[PDB]
Amino acid sequence: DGTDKNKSSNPSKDKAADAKTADKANSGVNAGDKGGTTVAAPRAQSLLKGVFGG
Amino acid sequence: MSNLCADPEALVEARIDEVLTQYRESPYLLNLIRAYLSKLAETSMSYCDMVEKFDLDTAVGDQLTIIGRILGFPRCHCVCDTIPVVGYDCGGSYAGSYQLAGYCEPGSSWIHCSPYGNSELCVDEDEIYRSLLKARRYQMLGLYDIESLHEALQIVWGEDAMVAETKVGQVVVTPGRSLTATETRYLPIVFRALPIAPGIKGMIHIDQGPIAGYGDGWAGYCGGDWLCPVDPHAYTCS
Amino acid sequence: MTYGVQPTGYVKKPLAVHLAEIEASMVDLFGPGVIQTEQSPLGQLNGLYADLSYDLDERGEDLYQSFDPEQAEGSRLDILARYRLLSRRAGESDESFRRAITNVDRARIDLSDLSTALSAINGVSWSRVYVNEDATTDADGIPPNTVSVAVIGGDDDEVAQLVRRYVVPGVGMYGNTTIETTIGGFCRRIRVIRPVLIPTSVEIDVQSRPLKNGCPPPSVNAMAAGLYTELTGPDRPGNGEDGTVYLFRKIMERLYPNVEVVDVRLSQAPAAPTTPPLVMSFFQMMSFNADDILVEIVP
Amino acid sequence: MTYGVQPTGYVKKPLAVHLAEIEASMVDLFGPGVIQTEQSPLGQLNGLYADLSYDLDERGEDLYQSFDPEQAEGSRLDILARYRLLSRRAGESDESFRRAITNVDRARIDLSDLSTALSAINGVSWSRVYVNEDATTDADGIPPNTVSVAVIGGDDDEVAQLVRRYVVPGVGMYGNTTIETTIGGFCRRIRVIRPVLIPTSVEIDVQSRPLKNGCPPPSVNAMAAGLYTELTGPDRPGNGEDGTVYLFRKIMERLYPNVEVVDVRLSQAPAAPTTPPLVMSFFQMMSFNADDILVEIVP
Amino acid sequence: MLEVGYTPPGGGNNIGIIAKGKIRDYQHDREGGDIISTVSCGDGDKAYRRATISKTIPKGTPLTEVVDEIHKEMKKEGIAKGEWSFPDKVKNTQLKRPYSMCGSCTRELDTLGRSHGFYWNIQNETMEIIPGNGHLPGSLLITPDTGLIGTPTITDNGIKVKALINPEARPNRMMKVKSQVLKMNRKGEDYRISEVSFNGDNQEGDWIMTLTGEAIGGDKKVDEGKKAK
Amino acid sequence: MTGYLGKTTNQDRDVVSAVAQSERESVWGEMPGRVVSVSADGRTVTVQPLYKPKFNGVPTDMPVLQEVPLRQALMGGVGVTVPVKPGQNVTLRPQMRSMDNYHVEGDGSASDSRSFSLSDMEAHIAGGESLKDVIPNLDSENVHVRAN
Amino acid sequence: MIELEVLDESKQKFSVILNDRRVTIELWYNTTNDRWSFSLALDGDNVVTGRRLVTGVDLLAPFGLGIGALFLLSENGEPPTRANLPLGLVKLYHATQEEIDAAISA
Amino acid sequence: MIELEVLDESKQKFSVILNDRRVTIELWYNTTNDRWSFSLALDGDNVVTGRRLVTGVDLLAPFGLGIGALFLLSENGEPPTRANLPLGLVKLYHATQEEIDAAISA
Incomplete structure (x- = not known):
């Protein structure tokens, strides 16, 4: 909870002292519902051939 | 990948670096923390032996059994065979109705063992079960051609093994060497693991020696012998 | 290092061993005069960290058993099967799906790939695979060097497209139903068996054999329902399986060991039950009805 | 449990939870008044624990993932590929190698795939593949459980390699020509068919019939050249095909809808034209020349 | 789509969709000289109007296949499937007598809810179902x-x-x-x-x-x- | 109908016609039904009507209607009868108000105070069968009375 | 198909309607192995947990979830890294089964 | 099971939903003997009144209320005192009949 004055505060990215510890302590950022950007038809067909054709 | 893990003393000191300045030189507190954390780091190192203990070329024991049950070839199989039984032949010789074992035989089984009580010959030597799994990889993929059955036989038996004839529905193989008793007893299980197309019958050369004839790859007067295919009785008593 | 991954499995370091190691570390740090009793400030810390170390051992065992089909469960059980590219059936249990991956006997490890892929088809209620690999026709009627398949359900197109890729060219098929298949223009005619169901009427005369005058045999209905379940299960009698006294006794005693089967009686319905055997051809199967089975206790 | 290895996979524990659990455990040991703040020695111990245990948690996740070919990366990916018989090609990246580990767990040896490969070899102008699967010898002379390959042109060594790569041991090979190629010093006697091209003389008599739109009937030489091209094309009559009224009427009618065929006459050069039942053995093939085709309209 | 969130000078992006809109009605407005464009949108609003189903449904059929059936018609109108969690009494119920459907989907959706006490709703073109x-x-x-x-x-x-x-x-x-x-x-x-x-x-x-x-x-x-009641 | 224009600025008109629409749903009317059993006194039938209203997007079934007053075309007993058997088709009609104890007592008023209840259906001969299932030999010129 | 944006956050979560199912995806970076991992929940139920993001394969294939293919791509086949995945040097894509079929047939 | 919080008050009263029932539990400290007593009301009727809180036993077993079990626990069986019960050195737990059955079967 973090309200207990006898315990440490919760690790969070904002109060971490390093980039590495910020990554380790990142509680998670949750965007809302997302819509993916569509891929143009020729590029999409090319990428799909590259992946799922062999 | 590469080295998954590092020495525990490296991880523990990497964490000790994060101690406060006011404790940087507290040998009792620092050593207490080291005692408590080095044990956890050492406990977790033991996992970095779950990496190549499952390598098919070097696995042993339960790690090889697990690979076998992934590949669908168990260590033991029903057969038409009087498996040797560990025990005493009343010294010189006793009549009895069993055959006895002497501290070095693949047919390790007691009277009370469950696989034995229902005729399941169980492969105990790792160097033979490993070969059987390597061959099973070919049944897996359906690699029934000669160009693959030959590598199946090289792994099971040796460099001198070869595939001889392709009649109508019947294919002959030879180890190319005298077989030891362990290999002879496990032979019925070898023909359950080899990549031979269903509906086609596997044979075996009588003398397990290289076959003779003409052309480039065979054996001549010295070393070769005349062909004679015989039924290994891999699935039947008859 | 006897612990961890060992030829016999993952060997766990006991909690007591963990705690002893921690205490040995603390004796060297503080001296022989240190107090570590289970109720002291230091003893409590040693307990907490020993528990944490043993919990790490637990995770190690979990990670080792996650690669063992006999212990793997769920999506990782599916990922393990993806090595042979097997697939689970709908509603299938972990026990069932692990038996397929392990190929428990199967009596012939070969053609198990075909046996399991067949069972993975949608609609296939029952399936069975047979082989005649000699240079002579067997008594069952299968020509030499032939693969026979018996299947109930599933569309013929899917069944045949599946069987074609498991049965190699040059090996025939024996059956009563023909399916024409085409890949790349080449047409192979796949023959399978769609067993003809012969309704069988069954009447059993049993005796009661209480094991040390204890739990007595169950009621007649409680036995006929069980026998029907056994005969309708996946271990139902196969094609070309004649109905014999042995076949039914081996089921009745197994289900109810406190009962002796005296007289089995069978017939092709609606005809009257009579003396076995009831001969079923290789294309015929016995089909049972929950009413036709009757059991009678005899003095 | 909620963390560690679970049916859905590896549920990794957050660092905040790693710290909160140890703080709660210390409260259980020393009462809720124990001082665990960041500055105290116990807070020092809790923070360093949380850190190390999160690291060990992450290494556990990596070890869990490295049992799956679709997630392993490198030498351990090689360990998992060796269960499916793939060796990392020198300099092949893990992406290309992991793609390569996606394979049929079943033979790709269908005769359609054989014939397609035959057609692809240089010099192979014509090819056909036949199979006898039944237990009886068919009328074309192919023994049971055999695959016959008829081919024209192409080098013999490469085609023999091709045939033996696709026909499994225990399946026969019917043909007239013998070839001997060596792989691994293993010379085999590969039997193929090199069809015997016997020239054929053809005479077709047709009745012109004006279409429903008003087209003119085609010229004699156009008829005789359109038939030559079809008969020398990839859809040509094969070996053992008896030049027949059916064959030639079907070709002529399909090419020239506004024309009816009266009769067909067939023979062998120089032998004079006779009835259209040109008999062919399975080894012979019908050959043709442009000038040896005679068409003529019947009033 | 109406995407809302926080974009701090450091940090990153917190922006996500809080309402996906099918325009309901728009109207400009002067206040002084301004032009404020007051939009109203639609939530499943193609399904609240144009979704009409066609169903004969027989006896014996379980009690969820036809939530799939109704979602077929509601999906013709561009609605997605959310989480469905029925009551336990619902999951196990079967049928004695046949099940009319002629008219309006949302109307007899409401009678569904009033009749087995469950909630259904559309949340940004995705339809969820829960128990009461x-x-x-x-x-x-x-x-x-x-x-x-x-x-x-x-x-x-x-x-x-x-x-x-x-x-x-x-x-x-x-x-x-x-x-x-x-x-x-x-x-x-x-x-x-x-x-x-x-x-x-x-x-x-x-x-x-x-x-x-x-x-x-x-x-x-x-x-x-x-x-x- | 619901939402003529959109999400959540729902017009006061919408959320009022929606209440009217729901209350218009709630009322019962005719529906075809299958006879389950026929009382020995010959005036009440156990009916499993062939309609399910819409439940959890799916078939649920409203239960077998009990002691449904069968209604032959008689006045004072003087009239025509049809032998009602388990499996035939009737048409049901609810009343404006229930008549519990106008049948339990013949003095004429039911329990609390409603309208239009499911528990108020009379079963009637004409209106129940499906057009798919054909009744043969419909005499189309002469007054025909049947016993089969 | 669609591209799914990745934030520059060592642990992030979002939701998307894939084949008209609400799929919630959670990505988290594992520093010890320097790799991204994803958990997937179908409409509130966690179905995939702790899978590694790897380029050039279908990540959802083993599970038969019926939500299409979720795959990662990069120009020269690099592996996804803490820096390289948010920068868009490696792109996360979702492809529908019909689109995959059409490409395979084309 | 669920843990029930105890405030640092001599007398207190909360309400909890157990086995689909609204239950009002009122705790009060008896100083003369240094103990806690509880009264329990189901749907407004005080069915239990003036019962001592004791460790290690189901306090509701005699009454057959159908709302499961309420019981106190501690690390080493220390009795619940004025100071001990609010501090959580002794804890109050509720478990259902189903959970009790499953645990016994374990």
Whole structure:
């Protein structure tokens, strides 16, 4: 909870002292519902051939 | 990948670096923390032996059994065979109705063992079960051609093994060497693991020696012998 | 290092061993005069960290058993099967799906790939695979060097497209139903068996054999329902399986060991039950009805 | 449990939870008044624990993932590929190698795939593949459980390699020509068919019939050249095909809808034209020349 | 699509969809000289109007295949499938007599709800179903250290909590609420989410959301409140 | 109909016609039904009507209607009868108000105060069968009375 | 198909309607192995947990979830890294089964 | 099972939903003997009154209320005192009949 004055505060990215510890302590950022950007038809067909054709 | 893990003393000191300045030189507190954390780091190192203990070329024991049950070839199989039984032949010789074992035989089984009580010959030597799994990889993929059955036989038996004839529905193989008793007893299980197309019958050369004839790859007067295919009785008593 | 991954499995370091190691570390740090009793400030810390170390051992065992089909469960059980590219059936249990991956006997490890892929088809209620690999026709009627398949359900197109890729060219098929298949223009005619169901009427005369005058045999209905379940299960009698006294006794005693089967009686319905055997051809199967089975206790 | 290895996979524990659990455990040991703040020695111990245990948690996740070919990366990916018989090609990246580990767990040896490969070899102008699967010898002379390959042109060594790569041991090979190629010093006697091209003389008599739109009937030489091209094309009559009224009427009618065929006459050069039942053995093939085709309209 | 969130000078992006819009009605407005374009949008609003089904349905059929059936027609109108969690009484029920469907989908959707006491709703072109006393998985924390404004206001059943709009808050989920007042209010921490309100501005009116939740009991069930026949 | 224009600025008109629409749903009317059993006194039938209203997007079934007053075309007993058997098709009609104890007592008023209840159906001969299932030999010129 | 944006956050979560199902995806970075991992929940139920993001394969194939293919791509086949995945040097894509079929047939 | 919080008050009263029942539990400290007593009301009727809180036993077994079990626990069986019960050195737990059955079967 973090309200207990006898315990440490919760690790969070904002109060971490390093980039590495910020990554380790990142509680998670949750965007809302997302819509993916569509891929143009020729590029999409090319990428799909590259992946799922062999 | 590469080295998954590092020495525990490296991880523990990497964490000790994060101690406060006011404790940087507290040998009792620092050593207490080291005692408590080095044990956890050492406990977790033991996992970095779950990496190549499952390598098919070097696995042993339960790690090889697990690979076998992934590949669908168990260590033991029903057969038409009087498996040797560990025990005493009343010294010189006793009549009895069993055959006895002497501290070095693949047919390790007691009277009370469950696989034995229902005729399941169980492969105990790792160097033979490993070969059987390597061959099973070919049944897996359906690699029934000669160009693959030959590598199946090289792994099971040796460099001198070869595939001889392709009649109508019947294919002959030879180890190319005298077989030891362990290999002879496990032979019925070898023909359950080899990549031979269903509906086609596997044979075996009588003398397990290289076959003779003409052309480039065979054996001549010295070393070769005349062909004679015989039924290994891999699935039947008859 | 006897612990961890060992030829016999993952060997766990006991909690007591963990705690002893921690205490040995603390004796060297503080001296022989240190107090570590289970109720002291230091003893409590040693307990907490020993528990944490043993919990790490637990995770190690979990990670080792996650690669063992006999212990793997769920999506990782599916990922393990993806090595042979097997697939689970709908509603299938972990026990069932692990038996397929392990190929428990199967009596012939070969053609198990075909046996399991067949069972993975949608609609296939029952399936069975047979082989005649000699240079002579067997008594069952299968020509030499032939693969026979018996299947109930599933569309013929899917069944045949599946069987074609498991049965190699040059090996025939024996059956009563023909399916024409085409890949790349080449047409192979796949023959399978769609067993003809012969309704069988069954009447059993049993005796009661209480094991040390204890739990007595169950009621007649409680036995006929069980026998029907056994005969309708996946271990139902196969094609070309004649109905014999042995076949039914081996089921009745197994289900109810406190009962002796005296007289089995069978017939092709609606005809009257009579003396076995009831001969079923290789294309015929016995089909049972929950009413036709009757059991009678005899003095 | 909620963390560690679970049916859905590896549920990794957050660092905040790693710290909160140890703080709660210390409260259980020393009462809720124990001082665990960041500055105290116990807070020092809790923070360093949380850190190390999160690291060990992450290494556990990596070890869990490295049992799956679709997630392993490198030498351990090689360990998992060796269960499916793939060796990392020198300099092949893990992406290309992991793609390569996606394979049929079943033979790709269908005769359609054989014939397609035959057609692809240089010099192979014509090819056909036949199979006898039944237990009886068919009328074309192919023994049971055999695959016959008829081919024209192409080098013999490469085609023999091709045939033996696709026909499994225990399946026969019917043909007239013998070839001997060596792989691994293993010379085999590969039997193929090199069809015997016997020239054929053809005479077709047709009745012109004006279409429903008003087209003119085609010229004699156009008829005789359109038939030559079809008969020398990839859809040509094969070996053992008896030049027949059916064959030639079907070709002529399909090419020239506004024309009816009266009769067909067939023979062998120089032998004079006779009835259209040109008999062919399975080894012979019908050959043709442009000038040896005679068409003529019947009033 | 109406995407809302926070974009701090450091940090990153917190922007997500809080309402996906099919335009309802728009109208410009002068105040001085300005032009304010007052949009109203549509939520499943193609399904509330143009979704009509065609169903003969026989006896014996289970009690969920036809939620799939109705979703077929509601999907012709571009609606997605959310989480469906039926009551246990519902999951196991079968049929004696056949099941008319002619007319309007939403109309007899409502009679569905009134007839087996369950909730169904459309949340940004995705349709969810829950029981009256139940909720769906997914929890969200609200504390003075996690975006709490004032009271975790107490109510008969649960709470009504204000906070900074921060996109996850969906109906039919769980919110764990902490403060310095709820403790002396003895009110729990986990609440279902039933009502969601978003009011905000770009310059002055901060992003504010208000969530009404009905408390979960010790039984993992929602405090429904007395339904009056 | 619901939402003529959109999401949540729902017109006061919408959320009022929606109430009217729901209350218009709630009323019962005719529906075809299958006879389950026929009382020995010959005036009440156990009916499993062939309609399910819409439940959980799916078939649920409203239960077998009990002691449904069968209604032959008689006045004072003087009239025509049809032998009602388990499996035939009737048409049901609810009343404006229930008549519990106008049947339990013949003095004529039911329990609380309603309208249009499911528990108020009379079963009637004409209106129940399906057009798919054909009744053969419909005499189309002469008054025909049947016993089969 | 569609591209799914990745934030520059060592742990992030979002939701998307894939084949008209609400799929919630959670990505988290594992520093010890320097790799991204994803958990997937179908409409509130966690179905995939702790899978590694790897380029050039279908990540959802083993599970038969019925939500299409979720795959990662990069120009020269690099592996996804803490820096390289958010920068868009490696792109996360979702492809529908019909689109995959059409490409395979084309 | 669920843990029930105890405030640092001599007398207190909360309400909890157990086995789909609204239950009002009122705790009060008896100083003369240094103990805690509880009264329990189901749907407004005080069915239990003036019962001592004791560790290690089901306090509701005699009454057959159908709301499961309420019981106190501690690390080493220390009795619940004025200071001990609010601090959580002794804890109050509720478990259902189903959970009790499953645990016994374990």
